[PDB]
Design a protein around this ligand. Structure first.
Ligand SMILES: *[C@@H]1O[C@H](CO)[C@@H](O)[C@H](O)[C@H]1NC(C)=O
Ligand SMILES: *[C@@H]1O[C@H](CO)[C@@H](O)[C@H](O)[C@H]1NC(C)=O
Ligand SMILES: *[C@@H]1O[C@H](CO)[C@@H](O)[C@H](O)[C@H]1NC(C)=O
Ligand SMILES: *[C@@H]1O[C@H](CO)[C@@H](O)[C@H](O)[C@H]1NC(C)=O
Lengths: 162, 162
């Protein structure tokens, strides 16, 4: 299996992601998105693209990306500080169940995987999530995929932020 | 007029704030919240307080505070990186109108004002906002209140983030 052959699941309407806030990552590829909270935001009233935004929040640092849909269930992210583009797909989504929400998303460079973000608001207890992670591990460079919350900073009275 | 005598307006249900996302600050007191976007977030499913969260996002930096209601329309914020407490009130709110949302919130130390955050998603065009700002300027230390967007960094394809 190669990264280009992973499932490209249908992307739920944006409100279903927003209603899942806040999410935390369970599995990631690089160190960048360890101990990270994901927040989805509807488009600004003054946005001329009317693109929603994904926020990756790690302590007091934040990366933001406006995004739009592209072909074959792609999400085309525009990183807000640089204008750099990223093309993402969803391996699966399972939003707004009786046990909350989960999904796994990935970024390829051809046959190899270069980033992975499995998110949930149920502490990784959706059986689909571990299952999907094990499949993503089988594509080239998937060996880097690892648990995202092994050594996170202590909290100071909040639950999704530190 | 002193800070303790400013109106303490009723705080709208949290969903009305979340539905107003994203907001930007129009007027602030210190430099800290210049060029800042505000995002409200519902409580995490795993939060034991079930407190919602306010996010103050300035470029790639973020401050987060879980908050709960207190007496006399207070909001009691817990800054998520330190556990430091802040007590806030709303001068007014005007959420989810045909011209969008605005509010002005403030933080006193006794008779003086020590922080001010007027937010909107309509670029400060609610007449109540400039009006409220002019009242807040009249309390001790209100002279520091100023326009929040005079010299913000250039954007790179997004609208509420840079
Ligand atoms: C994939 O990797 C190649 C080789 O480093 C690079 O030239 C290309 O820009 C990468 N693809 C994308 C979409 O950035
Ligand atoms: C979340 O899951 C991990 C095990 O994967 C565990 O260490 C942790 O205690 C769990 N948190 C809660 C609140 O149950
Ligand atoms: C208000 O200022 C006084 C004097 O500096 C200080 O002792 C006090 O802690 C401040 N109030 C709050 C609520 O922090
Ligand atoms: C927002 O308001 C300021 C004037 O206070 C103005 O400089 C700016 O052009 C306005 N933005 C838009 C998009 O109209």
């Amino acid at each position: 299996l190669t990264c280009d052959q992973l499932p490209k699941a249908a992307i739920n309407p944006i409100q279903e992601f927003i209603d899942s806030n806040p999410l935390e990552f369970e599995y990631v590829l690089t160190e960048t998105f360890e101990c990270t909270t994901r927040i989805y935001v509807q488009p600004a009233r003054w946005s001329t693209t009317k693109a929603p935004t994904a926020l990756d929040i790690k302590g007091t640092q934040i990366m933001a990306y406006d995004f739009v849909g592209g072909p074959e269930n792609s999400a085309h992210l525009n990183e807000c500080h640089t204008g750099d583009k990223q093309v993402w797909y969803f391996q699966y989504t399972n939003l707004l169940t009786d046990n909350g929400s989960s999904y796994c998303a990935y970024r390829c460079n051809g046959t190899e995987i270069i980033e992975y973000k499995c998110a949930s608001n149920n502490n990784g207890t959706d059986p689909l999530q571990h299952q999907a992670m094990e499949v993503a591990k089988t594509v080239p460079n998937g060996d880097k995929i690892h648990y995202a919350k092994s050594n996170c900073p202590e909290t100071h009275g909040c639950f999704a932020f530190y």
